[PDB]
Design a protein around this ligand. Sequence first.
Ligand SMILES: Cc1cc2nc3c(=O)[nH]c(=O)nc-3n(C[C@H](O)[C@H](O)[C@H](O)COP(=O)(O)OP(=O)(O)OC[C@H]3O[C@@H](n4cnc5c(N)ncnc54)[C@H](O)[C@@H]3O)c2cc1C
Ligand SMILES: Cc1cc2nc3c(=O)[nH]c(=O)nc-3n(C[C@H](O)[C@H](O)[C@H](O)COP(=O)(O)OP(=O)(O)OC[C@H]3O[C@@H](n4cnc5c(N)ncnc54)[C@H](O)[C@@H]3O)c2cc1C
Ligand SMILES: COc1ccc(OC)c2c(C)cc(=O)[nH]c12
Ligand SMILES: COc1ccc(OC)c2c(C)cc(=O)[nH]c12
Ligand SMILES: COc1ccc(OC)c2c(C)cc(=O)[nH]c12
Ligand SMILES: [Zn+2]
Ligand SMILES: [Zn+2]
Lengths: 230, 230
Amino acid sequence: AGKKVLIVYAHQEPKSFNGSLKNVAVDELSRQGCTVTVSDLYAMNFEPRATDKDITGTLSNPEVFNYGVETHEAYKQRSLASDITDEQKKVREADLVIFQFPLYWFSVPAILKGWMDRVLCQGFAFDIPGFYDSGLLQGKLALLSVTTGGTAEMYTKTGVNGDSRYFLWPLQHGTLHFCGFKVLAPQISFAPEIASEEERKGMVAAWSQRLQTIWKEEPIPCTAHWHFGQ
Amino acid sequence: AGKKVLIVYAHQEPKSFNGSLKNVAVDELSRQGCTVTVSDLYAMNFEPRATDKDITGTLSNPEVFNYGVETHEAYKQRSLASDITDEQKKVREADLVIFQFPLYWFSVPAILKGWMDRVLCQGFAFDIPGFYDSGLLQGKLALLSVTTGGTAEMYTKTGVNGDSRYFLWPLQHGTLHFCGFKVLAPQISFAPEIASEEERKGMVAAWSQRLQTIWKEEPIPCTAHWHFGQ
Ligand SMILES: Cc1cc2nc3c(=O)[nH]c(=O)nc-3n(C[C@H](O)[C@H](O)[C@H](O)COP(=O)(O)OP(=O)(O)OC[C@H]3O[C@@H](n4cnc5c(N)ncnc54)[C@H](O)[C@@H]3O)c2cc1C
Ligand SMILES: Cc1cc2nc3c(=O)[nH]c(=O)nc-3n(C[C@H](O)[C@H](O)[C@H](O)COP(=O)(O)OP(=O)(O)OC[C@H]3O[C@@H](n4cnc5c(N)ncnc54)[C@H](O)[C@@H]3O)c2cc1C
Ligand SMILES: COc1ccc(OC)c2c(C)cc(=O)[nH]c12
Ligand SMILES: COc1ccc(OC)c2c(C)cc(=O)[nH]c12
Ligand SMILES: COc1ccc(OC)c2c(C)cc(=O)[nH]c12
Ligand SMILES: [Zn+2]
Ligand SMILES: [Zn+2]
């Protein structure tokens, strides 16, 4: 309670394991008294491409299109497209942002990559100065809640896929830490599709339980050592 | 060379540094007598979202949609959307696939992540089993040609961003090696926007010059040790 949460959710099927993890997060955080908002990217048909449509009115340089410069200037001039500014409002108000998605190619599904690319623009999420520890979203918490096709064992250092931490680097460090977030420990639900009726219940309930004390948690130290060393 | 090359290119502006890099690759590979195809994903308005529009037949499970299961079936039955099969034909014929893109959030722009999520489907690019060294695209080469905002110094072990190889992992290992590609060493053009006019010219020529002898290169050992060290 006393806290706002945004859940950015990227799965096509409400009946999925991901849908159930999103729905228990809404149920538990709402029960606590928290303010909860969900960006259901597939239901929003969220646009993932970074294009000159993201700037309304006239371009800062209509001869040579530079997306990073154009969106930084549009942010400053309040001329970003309304899909982007609608998500920036949600993020500005939120104390915690939870991303709920299936792992696609050791990363986020493209529709959620497009949310990161287009919503987290210069002047909003980071700047010169203001990145990593001083990123502009500092004071906010972020959490990846990821489901995988691969088993926890495939995801060990000398397993086929390498350690989980290795694929988290670009998301936790290159994106969430960069913008100033304190990153809570990821929630990894390994291989739900090959698990029992039960077991899947256990993974959902562990997530609901964890959410009971989410505001007591300490952030991970979001460092190269955390992801790569021992 | 009697070889076919596919360049999958992700930049909005033909006059950009990335556009110069793509065009020098076409110029040099064409000069060598290679067969060259470019998939210019923004000009194509390439769809990045993985949705049930990607399958045109009867779904295997119309009550609970599972993108992986439905696209795997659809590939076997030939009922995937034609944009996906257009790209699969290009990849099937290619001996080398070059990806040319600006780094976005330590990864690929979302339009290109969509190309990976939708084009590299089960059945086509990998099977379970039939992945990493037994992936379905064995015998083919792939190369990432990436441009960055950050300087080379920023992308070292003790730099802010950590080593450049760390962010390559989900792309080289988790996607290309997974599909059975041999991965050539990445071409990383650091911080062109801050470079001098003539440093930019030097990076473009360094890539043209490397392309002269590309068919003589051996692939990297695409392992955890190469990416992260000891
Ligand atoms: C393009 C693509 C790329 C991929 N890349 C990777 C990758 O790099 N690495 C990797 O490891 N995997 C990868 N995968 C696999 C993907 O990560 C998994 O398929 C996904 O994470 C499984 O989550 P899901 O919600 O879609 O499972 P679901 O199939 O929706 O759920 C599993 C089962 O649980 C049921 N269920 C729903 N709610 C509940 C609940 N209340 N309690 C109990 N059961 C419930 C479902 O109906 C279903 O039978 C990829 C898949 C695709 C399509
Ligand atoms: C959403 C987003 C996320 C980003 N995330 C990251 C990230 O995680 N890490 C990171 O390091 N960076 C990041 N960046 C920055 C991005 O990677 C760089 O801006 C991009 O790599 C620079 O490439 P470009 O082709 O767009 O440069 P350009 O701005 O086109 O190139 C700079 C100059 O090169 C010139 N040029 C073009 N052709 C030639 C030629 N033949 N000879 C000489 N000069 C030429 C152009 O005219 C221009 O003046 C991000 C940017 C965005 C928009
Ligand atoms: C059934 O789907 C999957 C199951 C398990 C996987 O890794 C253990 C993958 C990977 C790595 C890529 C992918 O595209 N699909 C996968
Ligand atoms: C021009 O924009 C940028 C320049 C340099 C960068 O790193 C040195 C970044 C990073 C790391 C993330 C990002 O989103 N944008 C960047
Ligand atoms: C770590 O962040 C950064 C690294 C390197 C950069 O250029 C060399 C930038 C620029 C140009 C703008 C910016 O906002 N952030 C940057
Ligand atoms: Zn970090
Ligand atoms: Zn590898």
